[PDB]
UniProtKB/Swiss-Prot annotation:
Domain topic, free-text comment: The RS domain (871-946) is required for phytochrome B signal transduction through alternative splicing regulation.
Function: As a member of the SWAP1-SFPS-RRC1 splicing factor complex, modulates photomorphogenesis by regulating the gene expression and pre-messenger RNA (mRNA) alternative splicing of a large number of genes, including those involved in plant responses to light signaling. SR-like splicing factor required for phytochrome B (phyB) signal transduction and involved in phyB-dependent alternative splicing.
Protein name per UniProt: Protein RRC1
Quaternary structure, from the entry: Component of the SWAP1-SFPS-RRC1 splicing factor complex which modulates pre-mRNA splicing to promote photomorphogenesis. Interacts with SWAP1 in a light-independent manner.
Subcellular location: Nucleus speckle
Tissues in which the protein is found: Expressed in leaves, inflorescence stems, roots, flower buds, open flowers and siliques.
Full-protein residues shown: 789 to 842 of 946
Organism, as annotated: Arabidopsis thaliana
Disruption phenotype: Dwarfism and sterile flowers when homozygous and semi-sterility when heterozygous under normal growth conditions. Reduced inhibition of hypocotyl elongation under continuous red light. Plants lacking SWAP1, RRC1 and DRT111/RSN2/SFPS have pleiotropic phenotypes due to altered alternative splicing of many pre-messenger RNA (mRNA).
Length: 61
């Protein structure tokens, strides 16, 4: 039972992009940890760059 659907205009398309970034972020983080990344700066660095890239790629930022 959906409630308070957020999608009246262009946002309807943004709500979706938000997911593409989520799944991507998680998958990336894990892949990094297993890739041999055992440091915060490293992960944070890569992840950060990714989040920003994707966000800007989906015209979100």
């Amino acid at each position: 039972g959906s409630s308070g659907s957020s999608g009246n205009g262009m946002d309807e398309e943004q709500r979706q992009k938000r997911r593409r970034i989520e799944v991507a972020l998680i998958e990336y983080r894990e892949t990094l940890e297993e890739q041999g990344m055992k440091n915060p700066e490293e992960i944070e660095r890569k992840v950060e760059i990714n989040r920003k890239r994707l966000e800007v790629d989906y015209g979100l930022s």
